[PDB]
Design a protein around this ligand. Structure first.
Ligand SMILES: O=c1[nH]c(=O)c2nn[nH]c2[nH]1
Ligand SMILES: O=c1[nH]c(=O)c2nn[nH]c2[nH]1
Ligand SMILES: O=c1[nH]c(=O)c2nn[nH]c2[nH]1
Ligand SMILES: O=c1[nH]c(=O)c2nn[nH]c2[nH]1
Ligand SMILES: [Cl-]
Ligand SMILES: [Cl-]
Ligand SMILES: [Cl-]
Ligand SMILES: [Cl-]
Ligand code: NA
Ligand code: NA
Ligand code: NA
Ligand code: NA
Lengths: 295, 295, 295, 295
C-alpha cells in the first residue's frame, strides 16, 4: 500500500473581527468560517506513526486567529492568500495550503434613515466565499464565489422545444415561474505570489459586486428560454467585464412550482392563464451547470 | 383508558399565490407554509376504528388550496381566521381549528434603481408568523409573531452586578458584543368572529411593522444593562402603541462571542480594550424570555 | 406594563460523562444536551436593570458540569430532578427550575461477537428525553419521552370509511405503506420531592423500555385501520403496564409514499396490486396527536 | 465566450421499491435518493436557445422510476450502471451520465426474537452510496462509499510527538477520547461495460460489508497514535482483501471532547486521570484525509 494523496487541517473555524475608527466612532464587523488543509511531506504520520511532521490542527486554529489579528481580513481573497502563504513559508516540509473562507453578512442597520455606527443585521443567508490554493513553486490560485442567493420571477420564463420521446410527459410552456439558488464562481488567473495578489486588491470587491449585479439584472430582465440560456448570458457578461478572470461557473437548481388543478371542485379554474395558487415542490429539482471560458 | 385530548390535520403545506394587476403589469407573490389541526367529536376514530368522523388530512390540504384561491392570503391573520372558521362552520362535529402560518420573504428586486414588476429576492430567513385558534362559541384568538431576525451590536452592551457565589466564574463587563435571534409574539384581544377580524384588517400589517421597528431601534440605541432589561423596553413600547394587544412575549438567545487571549504568542494584546478578534460560540447559549402585559 | 411571566437560563449545554470500572476495565459513556431555565423573584432585572437577582447563565452552565461530576447522570429523570432541586434550594428567590435533557445514543460496539470495553457507535438518531419541572412547594413533575424513532411497514395498513364531501379526492384503500417518526411522552404522577424520585429509580429505565417495546410491537402487528386507531392501542398498553403514569401522549406524522402511475409508458402496471415503485413525499404530511389518560 | 464544460439533470429524486416473495409472505424495502447529470453535445441549449438537444430533466426523473420498475435496485452499483448506460445508449448526442445514489437504511424489525415480514426501522443515519460515471467509449467508473458512521472510543487514543513551535499550545497526551464520522470511499477498476459489472455483482455487497467491518474493528482495537495512523491501517486492510479496488479514501473529522477544569470549585478534580465530565465541542474540528493505493 502507498499514500497517493494526503491532506489535513482544521475545519469550521469561526472568526469575528471588529474594526473601530477612533475618529468617527464607527465600528465595522467581519464574521467568517475558515477551513485550512495542508499537504506536503507528511506521509510518515500515516504510515509510520511519525507525528514529528504534523503541525497540529489546534496550532493551525491558533494561526488563523493570530493572522486575523495582524492582518486585514478583507477582501477575503487577500486574507486567504496571506494565510496560505504563511504555512508554506514557515514550514519547510509543507508545500501546499488550501484555504476556504465563507463570509457571513453583517449589514449595517439604518435607524431613522441614518447608518448606525455599531449595529448590524444578518440581511440574508447569501454568502461570499473564497477558495485559495497556495502551492510552493506554482503560485496562488483563487476561486471566488457567491452562494445562497435565492430569487424568483413569476413570469417571463418559457420552456418549449425540448426533445419528446416515449419517456416524456412534460408539457411545453410559454409562461412559468422560475426560481433558483444561485451559486456562481469566478476563477482568477494564477498569481505569482502575494505581491501580485496585493497589486490587484481593489479588483476583488469590485468583481464580486459586478457578478452579483449581472446575475440579478440578467435574471430579472431575460425573457428566459431555459435556465441554460439565461445562465450563459450571465457568465458572458462577467467575463467581458473583468479580464483577469479565466472562467465563470454557475450551478443553478430549478426549484419547481407546480400548477394545481382545482377543476374537480365546482369547476374552479386555476391552470394556465387562470393559475393563481401553486404548490412549491421541495424535491426533486433540476440541476443545471455550465463553465464558460474565453475563446 | 380514555382520550383526554386529540387533534389531527396536515402540516407543512407549502402554498404560493400570485396577484397580477392587469392595469400596470405588476405582479406580487406570497409564499407560506401552513399547518391546520382540528379538534372535536372524533374520539371514536381512535377508540373504535370509526373513520366516519375523520375529515381526511388530504381533504384538509385541498381546502387550504381552495381557500387560498377564493380569498386574500394577506394579512395572514385574516387568511388564517377565514381558514379556521371554514372548518368549524362546515363540519358540525368539528369544534376547534388551529391554524399556523409561516410567511416567507419574497421582496421585490430593485434593478437600476427601479422596482421590478415580477422579480423577487429572498432577502433574509426572517419570518412573519401567525397562530390562529378558532373555537366554536369562544371566538378567534390570534398570536402574531416575527422570528429569525438576527442582529448584532459590537459595543454598548454591559453585564455587571450579577450574583456571585462559589459557582460563578464569569467576569463583570462594561463593554461586550450582543447578538441574538429575535422571536417576538404579540397576542391580540379575543375577537368574536370573522366580522370583527375583518374590521381590524389594517391594524395587522401596521402592528407587525411597528413591532419590527421598535425591536430594531431599541436594540441599536439601548446602552444595554442585560438582555432582560433591553427586551422589557421593547415590549413596553409595543404595548403602548397598539391597544388591541394584550401581551407581548420575547424569547432571545444570547449568542456568545468570546475574547481570545493571544498573549502567549509574542505578548500579542487581544483582550479588553485591545480585543479585535473573537471566537463566536455555537453552543451553549443563554436563553432569556419575558411576557409583558398591561397593569 | 407588568411582567406577567419570566424565565431565563442556559440552553444547548452539551455534556459527556464516562464511568470506568477499575475491576473489569469496562467503560460506559453518557452524552446529553441540557437546558435549564429558572423562574422566581427576578422581575426587577427586567424592569429596573437590577442584576443582583440574576444567577448568571454562565453559572448555570458551571453548575450543570459540577452536578454531573458529583452525581449519577442516569436515569436522566433522576439527574434532572437533582439538578432542578439544586437551584430552588440554593437560591432563596428562585422558586422554579425547568430542566430539559436530551440523551444521545452511544451503544457499545460488538467486535467479533464480543462487547467491546470502550468503543461505541451512534446506532441511530432516536433520543430519550426528559422534562423535569421542580416547583418550590409543589414537588417534581416529570415527563419522559422517546423521539426520532423512524419506522415503516410496507403493508397491513388500511384507510377507508372516512368522510367524503366536495373537498375530498382521496381514494379509499385496503393496502398502503405506513411510515412515521414516533414521538411518545409519558407523564409521571407528581412526586413530593427528591426522596420520592429516588425511591422509584428502577421504574424509569424499565418504563422507557416498555414504551419502546410496546410501540414497536404494536406498529408491526396491528392491521392498522388508521394512525389514530393504532396509536390508541399503544397508549392503552403503556398505561396498563405502569400505574405511576398518568397520561401518555403520542404525536405521529403520516409520512406519505405515493403510487406512481407508469401506464402512459408502454402500459407498464405499477398501481394497486401491481405497485412496486413509489415516490416518498417530503411534504406535506399528516400530523396525528392523542393524549390518553385513565378513566 | 465558449462553453468549456456543461452538465445538467435531476437531483434529489426519492425512490422506494418493494419486493414481495409470494411464497413466504416476506417483503423487503429499498429506499434511495438519486441524482443523474448528463453531458454531451448540448452546448447550443446554452449558447443559441436550442432546446432540441435537451432531454428534459422531468424526463430524466420519469426514466429513473421506469428503470427501477424494470430492473433490480440492488446492489446500487448495478442499478446505477444500468441507469447511466441507458442514457448514453438511448441518446446519440449524450456521451456521459453521472449517477449518484444514496441508500437509506430500512432494517427489518425483530419482534419477540423473530424477523418481522414487513416492518422496518431506520436503525441509523449511516448511508451506503455510489457514484457511477458512464462515459461513451471509456466504460464505467464506480466509486462506492459508506458515510455517516459515527463512532467514539473513550480511551486508547494518544497524540504526542507532534511539532511544537511558537504557534503551539496543545499539550501532548497519552489518553484521550477519539470520535469521528466515517466517510470511506473505494474506487473500483474501470469496467468495460454492463456485462463486466454484472459479472462482479456478488463482490459489491461483500466489499461494502468488509469495508464496514474493517473500519469498526480497526477503530475499536487500534491503540491509536493519531487519526492519520489509524485510518492508514483501515485502508491497507481493505485493499488487501479486494483486488478489484484501486484506491481507498478516508475523510475523518476529529470531533473534540475537551476536559473541564473544575478545580476553582472546592478543589474538585476533573482533569487527567481524574477526568470524568467533558465538554463536546461542536466546532472547530480537525479534518484528516488520506488516499491509499497500490505500490
Ligand atoms: O430550464 C429548464 N431546463 C431544463 O433542462 C429542463 N428540463 N425540464 N425542465 C427544464 N427547464
Ligand atoms: O444579558 C445577560 N443576561 C444574563 O442573564 C446573563 N447571564 N450571563 N450572561 C448574561 N447576560
Ligand atoms: O391514518 C390516517 N389518518 C388520517 O386522519 C388520514 N387522513 N388522510 N389520510 C389519513 N390516514
Ligand atoms: O489525531 C490527531 N491528528 C492531528 O493531526 C491532530 N492535530 N491536533 N490534534 C490532532 N489529533
Ligand atoms: Cl429542470
Ligand atoms: Cl446569557
Ligand atoms: Cl394523514
Ligand atoms: Cl485534529
Ligand atoms: Na514549505
Ligand atoms: Na362545527
Ligand atoms: Na428557592
Ligand atoms: Na450516446
Amino acid at each position: 500500500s502507498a499514500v497517493k494523496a494526503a491532506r489535513y487541517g482544521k475545519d469550521n473555524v469561526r472568526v469575528y473581527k471588529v474594526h473601530k475608527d477612533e475618529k468617527t466612532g464607527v465600528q465595522t464587523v467581519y464574521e467568517m468560517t475558515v477551513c485550512v488543509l495542508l499537504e506536503g511531506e507528511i506521509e510518515t504520520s500515516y504510515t509510520k506513526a511519525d507525528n514529528s511532521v504534523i503541525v497540529a490542527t489546534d496550532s493551525i486554529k491558533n494561526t488563523i486567529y493570530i493572522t486575523a489579528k495582524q492582518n486585514p481580513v478583507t477582501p477575503p481573497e487577500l486574507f486567504g492568500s496571506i494565510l496560505g502563504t504563511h504555512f508554506i513559508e514557515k514550514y519547510n516540509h509543507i508545500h501546499a495550503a488550501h484555504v476556504n473562507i465563507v463570509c457571513h453578512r453583517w449589514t449595517r442597520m439604518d435607524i431613522d434613515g441614518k447608518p448606525h455606527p455599531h449595529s448590524f443585521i444578518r440581511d440574508s443567508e447569501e454568502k461570499r466565499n473564497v477558495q485559495v490554493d497556495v502551492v510552493e513553486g506554482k503560485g496562488i490560485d483563487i476561486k471566488s464565489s457567491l452562494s445562497g442567493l435565492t430569487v424568483l420571477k413569476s413570469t417571463n420564463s418559457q420552456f418549449w422545444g425540448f426533445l419528446r420521446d416515449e419517456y416524456t410527459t412534460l408539457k411545453e410552456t410559454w409562461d412559468r415561474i422560475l426560481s433558483t439558488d444561485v451559486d456562481a464562481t469566478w476563477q482568477w488567473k494564477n498569481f505569482s505570489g502575494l505581491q501580485e495578489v496585493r497589486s490587484h486588491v481593489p479588483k476583488f470587491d469590485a468583481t464580486w459586486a459586478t457578478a452579483r449585479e449581472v446575475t440579478l439584472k440578467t435574471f430579472a430582465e431575460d425573457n428566459s428560454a431555459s435556465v441554460q440560456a439565461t445562465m450563459y448570458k450571465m457568465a458572458e457578461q462577467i467575463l467581458a467585464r473583468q479580464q483577469l478572470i479565466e472562467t465563470v461557473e454557475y450551478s443553478l437548481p430549478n426549484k419547481h412550482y407546480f400548477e394545481i388543478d382545482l377543476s374537480w371542485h365546482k369547476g374552479l379554474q386555476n391552470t394556465g392563464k387562470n393559475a393563481e395558487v401553486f404548490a412549491p415542490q421541495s424535491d426533486p429539482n433540476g440541476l443545471i451547470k455550465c463553465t464558460v471560458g474565453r475563446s
